[PDB]
Amino acid sequence: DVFQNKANVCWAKALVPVLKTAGIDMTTEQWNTVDYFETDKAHSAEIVLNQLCVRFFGLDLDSGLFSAPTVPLSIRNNHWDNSPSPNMYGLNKEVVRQLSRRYPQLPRAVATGRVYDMNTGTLRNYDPRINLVPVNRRLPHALVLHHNEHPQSDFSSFVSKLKGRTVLVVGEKLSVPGKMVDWLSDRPEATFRARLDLGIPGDVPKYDIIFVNVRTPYKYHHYQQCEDHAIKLSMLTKKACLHLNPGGTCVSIGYGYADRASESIIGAIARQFKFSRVCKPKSSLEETEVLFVFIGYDRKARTHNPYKLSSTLTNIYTGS
Ligand SMILES: *[C@@H](C(=O)N[C@H](C(=O)N1CCC[C@H]1C(=O)O)[C@@H](C)CC)[C@H](O)C(=O)NCCC
């Protein structure tokens, strides 16, 4: 009923019983504040739970707030449901007890599915603007002070100066002088036509260079833009590692890793490459936008020091 005229929102349907442990009842209109519900795209129930946890209670899942194993979130055949699996979530009321000393109204918030306003400590009706960052999370890098609405960046010049012969562009069409270009998009004039929300098709071949030319809209905060881009890093940028020639390069649009999922996904990708850096060329106008650059894919065993990329991201976003 709240899911009327939606083909791909099973993640939201599977979340209903998890959210109900914290008294939450999402209306269609409230669901519509999640971008991928509004545009009806496939998603991670887990990332959306973390997004909703922050908006409602001002805390992300590393708070332990939904760490009670009450309701399963299970993915069978690209379909999220509540079928038994050892991946279970639900309001953890011992954590609510621990948190209540610092946050007195929080127990009532999670009992009645109301927003705990981390500024006032008072209860509000659902509004995605009230809690913009998780207060429990120590951000690995600085976020931009101000954001502006700029035209889309043109990365044609940056990709043309990368080393390699065969490019796969994923998302928005990109011209690359001097290289062989295949194009992955849901546009019908694409070399490979597919839904990008289901990820890189397994049957896509291997390349020297993969460029993820996929953007995510800014709405409320750098933190929001980042967590909304997290599923694209997972479905496109991470899967690109299966589509690379040995020593190949993956470059991806991104917004840092303000959220836990982005930080984990970026760290998992980085271990597959000899070199990992964050670049912001002159072409990149939108202030939150960076390029993640992964060079020398070799599927070796290697340790990743996140402080390297975090340092670079802090410099870029603070203008240091
Ligand atoms: C999963 C998805 O949306 N699956 C659909 C589904 O079961 N729906 C549509 C919306 C409510 C629910 C229902 O009516 O029971 C199914 C009909 C599509 C074949 C979605 O594709 C997803 O997020 N996959 C996981 C992404 C990795």
Residue numbers in the entry: 468 to 787
List passages from the publication reporting this PDB structure:
The Venezuelan equine encephalitis virus (VEEV) nonstructural protein 2 (nsP2) cysteine protease (EC 3.4.22.B79) is essential for viral replication. The nsP2 cysteine protease (nsP2pro, EC 3.4.22.B79) cleaves the polyprotein at three sites to produce four functional replication proteins. The cleavage is essential to replication and the alphaviral nsP2 cysteine protease has been validated as a drug target by deletion and mutation. VEEV contains a single-stranded positive-sense RNA ((+)ssRNA) genome and is a member of the alphavirus genus.
While the compounds appear similar, the regions occupied by the inhibitors differ. Notably, the two inhibitors occupy different locations in the protease. CA074 makes 8 h bonds to the enzyme. Rates of inactivation by CA074 in the presence of 6 mM CaCl2, MnCl2, or MgCl2 were measured with varying concentrations of inhibitor, Mg2+ and Mn2+ slightly enhanced inhibitor binding (3 to 6-fold).
